[PDB]
Design a protein around this ligand. Structure first.
Ligand SMILES: C[C@H]1O[C@H](O[C@H]2[C@H](O)[C@@H](O)[C@@H](O[C@H]3[C@H](O)[C@@H](O)[C@H](O)O[C@@H]3CO)O[C@@H]2CO)[C@H](O)[C@@H](O)[C@@H]1N[C@H]1C=C(CO)[C@@H](O[C@H]2O[C@H](CO)[C@@H](O[C@H]3O[C@H](C)[C@@H](N[C@H]4C=C(CO)[C@@H](O)[C@H](O)[C@H]4O)[C@H](O)[C@H]3O)[C@H](O)[C@H]2O)[C@H](O)[C@H]1O
Ligand SMILES: C[C@H]1O[C@H](O[C@H]2[C@H](O)[C@@H](O)[C@@H](O[C@H]3[C@H](O)[C@@H](O)[C@H](O)O[C@@H]3CO)O[C@@H]2CO)[C@H](O)[C@@H](O)[C@@H]1N[C@H]1C=C(CO)[C@@H](O[C@H]2O[C@H](CO)[C@@H](O[C@H]3O[C@H](C)[C@@H](N[C@H]4C=C(CO)[C@@H](O)[C@H](O)[C@H]4O)[C@H](O)[C@H]3O)[C@H](O)[C@H]2O)[C@H](O)[C@H]1O
Lengths: 518, 518
């Protein structure tokens, strides 16, 4: 219509429509090992479905988990034994009964494990998981046909075969790591791998069958989440452990010497958690090498993650701009150097290979100019953690008035204390600063005040740890960085069920309503 | 530095620097007619400088005024008698004593005017302002030389001459408006204008001298503001009155019939303020005609505003996308229709002619898709008013969780009640809704709770009316839309001075500090 002319009679109702991709929402951070149950550890069975139902009733639409990789021996998902495999100790045994692979009589006696012991859980559950996998590979029915489909899926076998062979070799040998393996296994000579197949054929087929079982139980949890309107946000650990099929089967893509030993290892300089810095110990990526077959190993990680999650947190995102390299012999991280990461070049390859992708940049720590620019050049939202909001002055980016829309706000991460515990240890200048910003009734319910401040944010997504919805103290902390004992063990108390959290559900629902996050 | 290589030793300190154009700030809305003083009305003398000093001590860096045009007879700046002229009743007489144009003995006896009466002020001040202008045009000194410079400034005369001639003709004739003027004055015949100059030469030179005096006092106020770090935000009324030099000297650029009578007039459909809508009564722009000499009249408005202000509010911004046209004979606005505005085409011409300009879009009312898009396509911030936040649900754009960064947040505008008065009339559903969002101590200090909510916003600029800093009731309301009597009259109580507002100053300074607006 030309300037000056009349509009049609429905001009007043030509109102702007809210973008569905801009929808405000809330979520809960809860790793599946924290579910209750009689087998020493949480699993992908009934408790997972009950939690989704409870989460649905709160109005939350996001469930954030830690990485689902097989953890290290202290329970850590961030130096896993493989990059793409699933933690087979998350397999529900009760579910294997529904699938026909176990009979009820075989299910073991319950144990009291108010925290996870990964070794206790392993001794109790692995015999039955192997028995179930044995019955699966023996059968000729529909489930066997689904296993064969899984195996020869081109994008499963490009990681699954190497991982089975690796697990098989490690079962044959007494060595501490693959560094000590004999040269022909260590460097993957065809005949040596052929011999391993012949002598460890059954073990290999069992390992592949256990990965199929994990895959199946997880995809069912995720379908049930989708059915109840819940997206699952996974977690992509930046580094993988030395003793893994990933490092072993792609030596030239890591920073190792001629004999396979790491030249440099991962960590961060002196920070909040340690005076000497955090020495993680992982091997590091030879980025110029990776660049040369298009980061195909990184592109397969993201493809695997797309199959497991709706959305994905990229751990230590800053590491792709610049990474901290410590000499491999060092006993502390504080002696080390910053090195140039792959930058945008990695993310263009992920785009080109995988397509459109929902990524959350965990951009916490030392944030330099090149990190901020990388995050913005791929469009990924960053993070705000309220527990870091009350040091410094009013320009602190974690304070609500400084949040952005394309961002996720946490009360805290799995690396922080709970709110209660954090408030208990808090320095007095930081505490009275926080009282001026927050709305506090009783200090008992400081959790709800912080949760309230997170939801009132302009940030599109607000994530709360289950510990803070339950108002738990420091004994419920999931992880303390720069410590080796007593992490990754927290479980929901055996006496709290998802049917006894109606008050919490309502109180949350009220807040999401109030801040337009339903 | 290539991928994999070491960074230099100052990598940790390559931290991102905050953009100075992103600086958060606060301000006060206060029209100069509201200043105290003995002459029935506020002026650009000592009270203006005292306010700037007080404003500086609070930490605010913005002073927002209403349009400074000569108002209509009820005091309204939004249907002024001219578009570019200054309200000569804002001239300080005490300042004219300092300039040598008046002697102290001539200054009149004080009057008690706790609200402005524009006619009382006109009777009292105009004889002395004319006396002062007479002494100015009679002189041969430095001030006369500055007047001559003002006159022949090419971008002053392209509006000032028409406005003097118009005022001169109106002084000669008994007519109500220029519609009733004889054809040769009405249509600006050369010989008829020549005759006016010869018979009204002195009046004309006096009018031009009064505009010089306004210009001088205003530029001194603005230089003092700049010295104290205070920007002045003006206001660009969208429409100008029928009886003005603007309409008269540019007939073909308005929607008038062959004889000069308006075909259509301005207003808005049925809304919050009136069941029949607001019939403003102004003539309307013939936009296709204006497009044809590049909107040169609009481009001169903005040029004039650049000379008076740092930044400018565009009143009824939505009107440039679509405008409501009511038949001229109508007694209510509710019978009318929406017509297509000039859109981006106007703003490209302003860019091309004036350069870079700091514009605030007053995008309140009925907001259609084409308004949101126009605002965004020129990059202008919009507005949020907290007084409209508590109708509807959690998607209401005036609620703090929905603010954007490129935005100005107000407790209220000059069109709203004060906070106190607003809270006093508030419906009970709206009131308990507000109590859940706001932090309220005593209801007396509801003003400070709303001021707090405005400052805590992510919006880059927060503006508060002086009435709310003083915690005043509805009697201090500046304007009620769709009313004709009792507006534009509010003045600071004669017993409140800027030296007795230390507590207010501190309390504000505390809030700006807390929300990073210092
Ligand atoms: C944890 C987090 O750290 C970095 O960000 C921190 C930052 O450092 C802090 O300063 C702070 O920053 C705030 C700041 O305080 C505020 O002032 C400011 O305003 O805001 C900033 C935030 O912007 O907090 C942030 C965030 O917490 C990183 O940047 C961040 O990405 C990190 N979080 C990630 C990353 C990892 C990486 O793995 C996870 O790390 C966890 O897992 C590892 C691995 O298990 C664990 O390490 C333990 O286990 C190792 C295996 C062990 N290594 C030994 C191994 C051997 C075998 O070879 C031995 O031979 C030898 O003895 C050792 O090498 C480690 O010793 C052991 O510690 C980490 O502890 C654990 O945290 C994080 O979970 C993940 O979220
Ligand atoms: C005022 C404001 O109105 C519009 O926006 C409103 C909106 O209409 C409201 O509904 C509400 O919207 C909210 C809503 O409630 C919420 O639910 C929702 O969530 O948010 C929205 C906000 O987005 O509030 C908004 C904002 O207040 C416009 O869109 C907005 O731009 C307007 N504000 C501007 C514009 C003007 C333009 O004039 C100013 O108007 C003021 O000045 C005029 C001029 O004096 C005054 O009019 C009086 O004086 C006239 C001379 C008189 N005319 C008579 C003349 C005659 C002869 O010619 C007579 O014969 C005849 O009887 C008359 O025509 C008028 O009668 C008289 O009223 C206005 O009253 C005065 O307000 C605003 O100050 C400025 O801020």
């Amino acid at each position: 219509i030309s300037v000056g002319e009349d509009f049609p009679s429905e001009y007043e109702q030509w109102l702007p429509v809210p973008d569905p991709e801009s929808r405000r929402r809330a979520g809960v951070l809860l790793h599946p090992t924290s579910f209750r149950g009689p087998h020493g550890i949480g699993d992908l069975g009934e408790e997972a479905f009950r939690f989704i139902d409870w989460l649905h009733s709160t109005g939350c639409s996001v469930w954030q988990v830690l990485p689902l990789v097989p953890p290290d021996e202290g329970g850590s998902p961030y130096a896993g034994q493989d990059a793409n495999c699933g933690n087979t100790l998350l397999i529900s045994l009760d579910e294997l009964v529904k699938d026909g692979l176990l009979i009820k009589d075989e299910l073991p006696q319950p144990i009291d494990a108010d925290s996870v012991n990964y070794q206790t859980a392993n001794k109790l559950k692995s015999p039955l998981i192997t028995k179930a996998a044995k019955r699966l590979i023996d059968g000729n029915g529909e489930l066997k046909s689904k296993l064969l489909d899984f195996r020869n899926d081109p994008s499963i076998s490009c990681w699954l075969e190497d991982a089975a062979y690796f697990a098989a070799i490690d079962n044959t040998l007494n060595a501490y790591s693959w560094f000590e393996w004999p040269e022909p296994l260590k460097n993957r000579h065809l005949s040596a791998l052929e011999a391993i197949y012949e002598s460890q054929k059954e073990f290999i087929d069992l390992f592949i069958a256990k990965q199929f079982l994990f895959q199946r139980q997880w995809q069912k949890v995720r379908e049930y989440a989708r059915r109840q309107g819940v997206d699952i946000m996974g977690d992509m650990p930046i580094y993988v452990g030395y003793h893994s099929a990933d490092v072993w089967a792609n030596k030239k893509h890591f920073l190792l010497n001629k004999k396979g030993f790491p030249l440099l290892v991962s960590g961060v300089p002196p920070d909040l958690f340690s005076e000497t810095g955090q020495l993680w110990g992982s091997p590091l990526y030879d980025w110029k090498a990776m660049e040369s077959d298009q980061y195909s190993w990184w592109v397969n990680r993201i493809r695997r993650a797309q199959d497991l999650y709706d959305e994905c947190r990229i751990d230590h995102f800053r590491g792709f701009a610049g990474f901290w390299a410590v000499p491999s012999e060092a006993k502390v991280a504080m002696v080390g150097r910053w090195k140039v990461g792959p930058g945008k070049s990695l993310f263009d390859a992920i785009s080109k290979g995988v397509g459109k992708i929902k990524i959350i940049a965990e951009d916490l720590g030392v944030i330099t100019k090149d990190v901020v620019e990388l995050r913005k050049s791929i469009g990924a939202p960053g993070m705000a953690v309220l527990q870091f909001a009350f040091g410094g002055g009013a320009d602190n980016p974690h304070l609500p008035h400084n949040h952005e829309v394309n961002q996720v706000v946490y009360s805290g991460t799995h690396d922080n204390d709970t709110i209660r515990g954090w408030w208990d240890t808090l320095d007095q200048e930081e505490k009275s600063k926080a009282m001026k910003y927050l709305s506090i009734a009783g200090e008992d319910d400081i959790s709800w005040s912080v949760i309230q401040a997170a939801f009132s944010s302009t940030a599109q997504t607000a994530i709360i740890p289950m510990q803070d919805i339950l108002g738990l103290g420091s004994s419920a902390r999931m992880n303390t960085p720069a410590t080796e004992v007593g992490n990754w063990g927290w479980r929901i108390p055996s006496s709290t069920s998802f049917d006894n959290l109606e008050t919490e559900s309502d109180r949350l629902r009220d807040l999401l309503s109030l801040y337009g996050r339903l």
